[PDB]
Design a protein around this nucleic acid. Structure first.
Ligand SMILES: [Zn+2]
Ligand SMILES: [Zn+2]
Ligand SMILES: [Zn+2]
Lengths: 136, 52, 224, 133, 319
RNA sequence: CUCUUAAGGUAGCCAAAUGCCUCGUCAUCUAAUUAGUGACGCGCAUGAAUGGAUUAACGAGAUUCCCACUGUCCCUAUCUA
RNA sequence: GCAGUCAAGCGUUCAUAGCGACAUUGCUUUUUGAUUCUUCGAUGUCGGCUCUUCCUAUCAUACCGAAGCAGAAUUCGGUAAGCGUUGGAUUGUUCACCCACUAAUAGGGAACGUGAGCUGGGUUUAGACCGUCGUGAGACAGGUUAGUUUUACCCUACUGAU
């Protein structure tokens, strides 16, 4: 999990499992990301791994810039639709699951993030915060 | 900084020993007969490696 | 002087800290040597305040301050605001902004006497900014990267940009600001230059990985 | 208008680039994790070479499926967008095959560079076990 | 500068194993000549040639006894099909020789643009014919061994029908079939020696290629983008639109990334969507599959295009 | 020229519901494919009304891929007779 | 399949740090075979799903020893089976191969565990198609497609209950 993570997170409701196809905010030409795996993600029979906000995933592009697709690449999810709980009590959610392409060291490939971003990702991945314009 | 007057002492308890070829157990350098029973009190010993 | 440190293990100091000619800001993650890049470089010249706005440690890219004012987003709470009002002078005018963006330090590149703002900022913040900081604005671009305060550090005496910056745009911003600048990367070839460091008149701060050929251009362009 | 940040002196372009060509040639490497000399097996009667587990591909010496077998062999070349895989001439009676490879490895951030490197393939005689008026 | 070695000194002797040794040594020198070019011309621009020795050892049994040869070459682009070192090669032995090379497959061109190529030879003293001085428009097949030779697939196995016309040898879609040379005899005065499959190397227009128009198989090609790009460069889009009956794009990328006359990445994204061929894992256009069906139509004769002979011309072919 | 008493697989087609070796080879689809498609064909053992090849339309026929869809699944819960 | 004993040598020198030929001693019944005792008035016969328990010849985790152990990383060995040992493409698959996460992706048994527990893709009735064989009926452990999966209310066991 700590492959570029500055800090360490609380548990967030695991929204989108593998097979999920979430948008891509970064300005790297992509349009969607097919999650194939998750860092962390222990094992249980017949359980398929899941990704929460702030988690790293390993991903596969389906639409955008054939230079990119047909290969795996790390990614960082920054919006999810599953209502999750903050320690201040409130349950929040976004309107779409969306992510970012990234390198294993937690850095990014793109120069911006088209949309809002979760504090539970941005505190943790710092190179995302410098490229985000909005946080929640 | 170990001042080899004292390096000799540390080596008495660390690196002046003899080891079984059959159980890999620290034994004294003068002794035969590995004291452990699972080896069968054998006599196949060697010195411990100190140079290269 | 470029006093290099890492926050915890991250070389991105303009994320976690902020520094100007009257104060400095830092987050809550320990690593006392990191504080010893200012507590060792400053006497009692100015204060260093430890804060976590909104539960966030990322002070620099959420906040946006100057010599006579600090801009602070909407989500921040009165209790992270109260210590920030007390342990600073009464000179700086604090003000919770009530606009749509939040990462103010990724849209603003402010020094004491000029600024640069993200294009689609609120036109009410367009004037709040000059009423609280007393500074002008020019909300155009850097090289196409709308996020200006992350891809440009600033002092009054110098400037810095990423290496993709067109030499036409470099001289453009020079003609804007009456400050020099260079297409200088940081932290061993990073493009997030606004976050890889925080600069003042006499003090620069980068990451431990930041290398001497980068310090060379930094001390040149910023000190004078 | 920049400076290298490693060598320092050079003012490189503004297309999106990284530290100077000499430093990225010397320090930065994108061809690590490959054995330069690669071993293969061969018989003089059956003339059926193989990847270490495999049925005999039946191709001839100095053919096109040597590329397929040599790439199928476990190196790092399969992972990084190969192109231009030709066969360099070698002495027939040296019993080694010489092939250059190019990989499109990404630099520090979204900047591509061309690479010129080479692998040599040594072949050892075998009785080819399945085979054995 | 050289494309064929020398084949000297037969002398009607013995040592069956040695008359092929001497050929092997003419080949070792030929292979050495081919190798030093890679250090000379950069070190990436390679060439299309037959690595195997037996294929040229076959070609060496079918000309010295042929005694008169003709050179089939398509009328699409003779420039990279003209053989450079035949004139320097079959002239020396002082016997039945002098090919007088030809250009052929001259039924896919308009009439005003055939003198446009006939005039490329009125200046430079070259032999030719037009068969699929001014008293000549076009004449059919009316116009001792002999031989026919071609790049690969120029119609060497389809102009066997110029003599008898019953398809005595198989014509295929792939070029890699003809080999193990065939011989045809008729009329009891003339003989043939139908060659095996060939290519010929080259150094100009090496890697940037429209050479993949008749030379290589279209199927087992891992690039799919270069030749498709050079296809999209030519043949303006307001003909491909009217022929295929599909509205692809309007080229919104009007900036310095793509420009006008779109390249072969935005042209094929809406075509496999019109033809439904979708990937195995997501619904998106499969350009690596869609390029092949378009290139096959480009090569077979559904889309035509011919090349200006000597120099820089914007638009010589008028469809 | 011949050998087997007659002839000696023409046109066409294919790892095909016919191909053992075989998860054949190459390309493609996929992150990954013993599958699928196209192509190659000395084809154990294709083949011309024991009909070959191609074929619009049709099919409760066999098969692969995609868009949409969903408790099929992640991972179970609840309600009614 | 696993292990051991001599130890000619490899091992920059250094048989045995590690490995180790020529020979030689055994263990195992998770292979295949041989045999034919039981079962032909029938013990429901591939695989997967589910679920529990056991074994150790330990993949990981704990404490230790030894190295050709500087550190880092690795290998050899020991007590040890308490705890865990995956998601997926292709295949009916056992088996296998790849992608990927992971601390790790160890092997095995229980009537080759488990069909009155499921499924029924495969195989193994009947319909039908091709190839090869045969004069032919018809054959093929060759390929393809379709093809009824019954009963528990008893005794015991188990779970709970008086
Ligand atoms: Zn012992
Ligand atoms: Zn340099
Ligand atoms: Zn053999």
């Amino acid at each position: 999990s700590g492959n570029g993570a500055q800090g360490t997170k609380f548990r967030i409701s695991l929204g989108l499992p593998v097979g999920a196809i979430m948008n891509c905010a970064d300005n790297s030409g992509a349009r969607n990301l097919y999650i194939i795996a998750v860092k962390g993600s222990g094992s249980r029979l017949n359980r398929l791994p899941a990704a929460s906000l702030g988690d790293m995933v390993m991903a596969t592009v389906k639409k955008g810039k054939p230079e990119l697709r047909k290969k795996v690449m790390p990614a960082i999810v920054v919006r999810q639709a599953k209502s999750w709980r903050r320690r201040d009590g409130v349950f929040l959610y976004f309107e779409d699951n969306a992510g970012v392409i990234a390198n294993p060291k937690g850095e990014m490939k793109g120069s911006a993030i088209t949309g809002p971003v979760g504090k539970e990702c941005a505190d943790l991945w710092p190179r995302v915060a410098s490229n985000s314009g909005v946080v929640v | 900084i170990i001042e080899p007057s004292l390096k000799a002492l540390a080596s008495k308890y660390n690196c002046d020993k003899s080891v079984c070829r059959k159980c890999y157990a620290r034994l004294p350098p003068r002794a035969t007969n590995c004291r452990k029973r699972k080896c069968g009190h054998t006599n196949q010993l060697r010195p411990k490696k100190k140079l290269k | 002087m470029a006093t290099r440190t890492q926050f915890e293990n991250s070389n991105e100091i303009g994320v976690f800290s902020k520094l100007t000619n009257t104060y400095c800001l830092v987050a809550v993650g320990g690593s006392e040597n990191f504080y010893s890049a200012f507590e060792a470089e400053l006497g009692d010249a100015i204060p260093i305040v430890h804060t976590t706005i909104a539960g966030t440690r990322i002070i620099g890219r959420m906040t946006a301050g100057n010599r006579r004012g600090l801009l602070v987003p909407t989500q921040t709470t009165d209790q992270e605001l109260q210590h920030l009002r007390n342990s600073l002078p009464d000179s700086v005018k604090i003000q919770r902004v009530e606009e749509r963006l939040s990462a103010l330090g990724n849209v603003i590149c402010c020094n004491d006497y000029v600024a640069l703002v993200h294009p689609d900022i609120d036109r009410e913040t367009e004037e709040l900014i000059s009423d609280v900081l007393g500074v002008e604005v020019f909300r155009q671009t850097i090289s196409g990267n709308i996020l200006v305060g992350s891809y440009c550090s600033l002092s009054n005496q110098g400037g810095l940009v990423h290496p993709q910056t067109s030499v036409q745009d470099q001289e453009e911003l020079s003609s804007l600001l009456q400050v020099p600048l260079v297409a200088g990367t940081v932290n061993r070839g990073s493009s997030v230059v606004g976050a890889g460091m925080v600069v003042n008149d006499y003090l620069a701060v980068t990451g431990l990985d930041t290398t001497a050929p980068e310090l060379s251009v930094i001390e040149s362009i910023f000190r004078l | 208008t920049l400076l290298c940040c490693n060598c320092g002196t050079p003012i490189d372009g503004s297309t999106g680039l990284v530290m100077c060509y000499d430093c990225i040639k010397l320090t930065v490497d994108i061809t690590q994790g490959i054995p330069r000399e690669a071993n293969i097996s061969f018989c003089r009667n059956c003339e059926r070479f193989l990847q270490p587990p495999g049925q005999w591909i039946r191709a001839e010496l100095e053919s096109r499926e040597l590329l397929a077998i040599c790439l199928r062999r476990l190196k790092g070349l399969t992972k990084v967008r190969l192109v231009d895989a030709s066969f360099i001439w070698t002495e027939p009676h040296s019993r080694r095959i010489r092939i250059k490879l190019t990989v499109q490895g990404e630099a520090m951030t979204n900047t591509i560079i061309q690479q010129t490197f080479e692998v040599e393939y040594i072949v050892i005689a075998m009785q080819c076990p399945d085979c054995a008026r | 500068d050289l494309i064929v070695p020398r084949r000297p000194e037969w002398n009607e002797g013995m040592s069956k194993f040695q008359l092929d040794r001497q050929e092997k040594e003419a080949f070792l020198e030929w292979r050495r000549k081919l190798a030093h070019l890679q250090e000379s011309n950069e070190d990436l621009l390679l060439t299309p040639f037959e690595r195997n020795i037996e294929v040229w050892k076959q070609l060496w049994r079918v000309v010295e006894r042929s005694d008169l040869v003709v050179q089939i070459v398509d009328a699409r682009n003779p420039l990279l099909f003209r053989s450079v070192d035949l004139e320097r090669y079959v002239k020396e032995s002082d016997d039945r020789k002098a090919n007088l090379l030809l250009v052929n497959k001259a039924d896919l061109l308009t009439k005003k643009q055939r003198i446009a190529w006939a005039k490329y030879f009125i200046s430079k003293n070259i032999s030719f014919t037009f068969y699929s001085v001014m008293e000549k428009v076009k004449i059919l097949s009316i116009d001792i061994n002999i031989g026919l030779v071609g790049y690969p697939n120029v119609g060497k196995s389809s102009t066997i029908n110029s003599l008898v016309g019953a398809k005595k040898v198989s014509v295929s879609s792939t070029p890699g079939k003809t080999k193990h040379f065939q011989t045809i005899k008729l009329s009891d005065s003339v003989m043939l020696c139908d060659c095996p499959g060939l290519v010929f190397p080259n150094f100009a227009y090496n890697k940037g290629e429209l050479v993949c128009n008749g030379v290589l198989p279209i199927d087992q090609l891992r690039d799919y983008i270069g030749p498709a790009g050079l296809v999209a460069e030519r043949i303006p889009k307001y003909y491909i639109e009217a022929i295929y009956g599909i509205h692809i794009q309007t080229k919104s990328r009007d900036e310095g990334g793509n420009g006008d006359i779109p390249t072969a990445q935005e042209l094929l994204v809406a075509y496999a969507r019109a033809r439904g061929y979708m990937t195995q894992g997501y619904g998106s256009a499969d350009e690596p599959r869609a390029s092949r069906y378009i290139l096959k139509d480009y090569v077979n004769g559904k889309l035509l295009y011919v090349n200006p002979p000597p120099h820089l011309e914007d638009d010589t072919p008028y469809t």
